[PDB]
């Protein structure tokens, strides 16, 4: 049945159907997010244009529905938007000051110092896979390998103690799940804020060799970051650094296992692993929808107008399936396509993902290490039967049962 507003299903029962419908109704279309209306950008070229348009800001105070009190903290998606001041909420000249220390710490050269730590965690978790898969038993690749690894890496970078990481994982699972009761979710949001507040206090009194300390003590240059800004950057870096990288690792393994000819190309050195990672990001990336941007004034696109105060969502999954950019086979996984590295699954413009080099590095180490260690790894359950968790905006897989072979 036809409707002009596409309701994003919170259970993610038909992700493929929604992504195709969003593309067909694009590049700009109305969507419904749990009773709240917004515009969705589903086209590649229009996304690049709007992601650099200074009239679209992240600040929730620019949202006419927030101004009128129509949307409140009872909205189950409010934790994705109504967050503390950070690089994720600011635009304009002040944005660069909130990003500079993080981008400096996340350059390829800076990450070379972190590479041996990543190698150690990959090796340790491969040992866990080996023990778990003994005697031909079925193993959850997510819980044993892909789920803990990015948390370990981002915790080492930021300075999160090893004993605290299980609690963070429990919090994020409740934070992202649509099934979490809203009173519990807001409570989890408060508990996470309290944890990172105390972590910043702990690093202020006793700084260490970690990014959090660098945010706290920026040394020469610029106004010091406020407590809210340090906590906000910390919160965004851990959340994204963990959530998105877990998805990239799992979807890459799923794509390569279901395309064994292409897995052979990367294992034999005919196609680079980073090219396989790029096509995974384009075809099956971590972000489904990015909430949210708001128009500070009317934005005229010629045929259509984005009214002042309207909310605008970047539908990165639909954007990756753009037929105008990638061709008629955009819905297929093909690491040999020429437009693989043309994706914008890390974003575009000022808010482009600062951890993109780290995400690429983690996947580029973990993936060949996994398939070299277990060359006969294969699913114990048909890959197409692996369901998504009920997470509206993130491409989160539930579990990944495999046999080591």
Ligand X SMILES: C[C@]12CC[C@H]3[C@@H](CCC4=CC(=O)CC[C@@]43C)[C@@H]1CC[C@@H]2O
Interacting stretch for K ion, rule CB under 5 A, among 152-160, 185-193, 324-332, 388-396?
324-332
Provide the minimum distance between the beta carbon of 332 and Cl ion in the complex, in angstroms, as a whole number: 18
Structure tokens at 322: 């753009």
Residue from the set 13, 52, 104, 226 that interacts with its own copies by CB under 8 A: 13
Question: Does 286 interact with ligand HEM (rule: CB under 6 A)?
Answer: yes
- Determine the Cα–Cα distance for residues 233 and 346; give it in Å rounded to an integer: 17
Nearest partner of 284 among 257, 261, 240, 318, judged by Cα: 318
- Rounded CA separation 150/137 (Å): 25
Check binding of 349 to its own copies (CB under 8 A). Answer: no
Q: Cβ distance 55 to 70 under 8 Å?
A: no
Interface with ligand X includes 229 (CB under 6 A)? no
What are the CA-CA distances from residue 213 to residues 42, 111, 114, 353, 372 (Å)?
39, 17, 16, 21, 37
Q: Which one of residues 209, 220, 300, 303 is an interface residue with its own copies (CB under 8 A)? A: 303
71 φ/ψ sector (left φ>0, alpha ψ -120 to 50, else beta): beta
User: Which residues inside 272-291 make contact with its own copies, applying CB under 8 A?
Assistant: none
| 334: contact with ligand X by CB under 6 A | no
The values of phi and psi at residue 247, to 5°, are -65, -45
Residue 278 contacts which entry, ligand X, its own copies, Cl ion, none (Cβ below 5-8 A, type-dependent): Cl ion
131 is a contact residue toward its own copies (CB under 8 A): yes
Is residue 313 a contact point for ligand X (CB under 6 A)? Answer: no
Nearest-angstrom CA–CA distance, 106 and 270: 29
* Known binding-site residue numbers for Mg(2+): 2, 4
Q: Does 88 bind ligand X (CB under 6 A)?
A: yes
User: Residue of minimal CB distance from K ion?
Assistant: 332
Distance CA 60, CA 73 (A): 12
Known binding-site residues equal 2, 4, 95, 99, 293, 316, 351, 353
Identify which of residues 139 and 216 has a Cβ nearer to its own copies in the complex: 139
Contact between 287 and ligand X by CB under 6 A: the answer reads yes
What whole-number distance in Å separates Cα of residue 217 and Cα of residue 105? Answer: 14
The stretch among 128-136, 175-183, 284-292, 365-373 that binds ligand HEM (CB under 6 A) is 284-292
- Contact residues for Cl ion, defined by CB under 5 A: 278
């Amino acid at each position: 049945p036809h409707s002009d507003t596409l309701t994003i299903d919170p259970m993610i029962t038909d992700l493929a159907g929604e992504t195709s419908r969003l593309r067909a109704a694009g590049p700009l279309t109305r969507i419904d997010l749990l009773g709240v209306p917004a515009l969705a950008v589903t086209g590649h070229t229009l996304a690049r244009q709007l992601l650099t348009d200074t009239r679209l800001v992240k600040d929730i105070n620019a949202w006419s529905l927030w101004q009128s009190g129509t949307v409140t903290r009872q909205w189950p998606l409010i934790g994705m938007i109504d967050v503390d001041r950070s690089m994720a909420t600011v635009d304009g000249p002040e944005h660069r000051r909130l990003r500079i220390k993080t981008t400096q710490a996340l350059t390829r050269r800076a990450l070379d110092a972190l590479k041996p730590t990543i190698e150690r965690y990959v090796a340790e978790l491969l040992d866990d896979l080996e023990r778990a898969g003994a005697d031909g038993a079925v193993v959850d690749l997510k819980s044993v390998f892909a789920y803990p690894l990015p948390m370990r890496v981002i915790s080492a970078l930021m300075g999160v103690p090893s004993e605290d990481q299980e609690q963070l994982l429990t919090w994020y699972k409740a934070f992202f799940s649509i099934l979490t009761p809203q009173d519990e979710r807001l409570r989890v949001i408060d508990e996470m804020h309290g944890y990172f507040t105390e972590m910043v206090r702990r690093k202020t009194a006793e700084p260490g060799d970690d990014l959090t300390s660098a945010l706290i003590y920026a040394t020469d240059g610029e106004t010091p970051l406020t407590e809210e800004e340090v906590i906000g950057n910390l919160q965004a870096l851990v959340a994204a650094g963990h959530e998105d990288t877990v998805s990239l690792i799992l979807t890459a393994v799923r794509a390569l296992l279901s395309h064994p000819e292409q897995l052979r190309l990367v294992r034999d050195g005919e196609i680079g692993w980073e090219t396989a990672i790029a096509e995974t990001l384009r075809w099956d990336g971590p972000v489904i929808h990015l909430l949210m941007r708001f128009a500070t004034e009317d934005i005229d696109l010629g045929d259509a107008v984005i009214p002042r105060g309207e909310g605008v969502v970047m539908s990165y999954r639909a954007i990756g399936r753009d037929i105008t950019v990638h061709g008629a086979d955009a819905d297929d996984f093909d690491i040999t396509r020429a437009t693989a590295a043309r994706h914008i699954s890390f974003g575009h413009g000022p808010h482009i993902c600062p951890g993109a080099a780290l995400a690429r590095l983690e996947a580029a180490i973990a993936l060949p290490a996994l398939f070299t260690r277990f060359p006969h790894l294969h699913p114990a359950l048909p890959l197409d039967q692996i369901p998504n968790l009920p997470v509206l905006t993130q491409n989160d897989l539930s579990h990944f049962p495999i046999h080591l072979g």
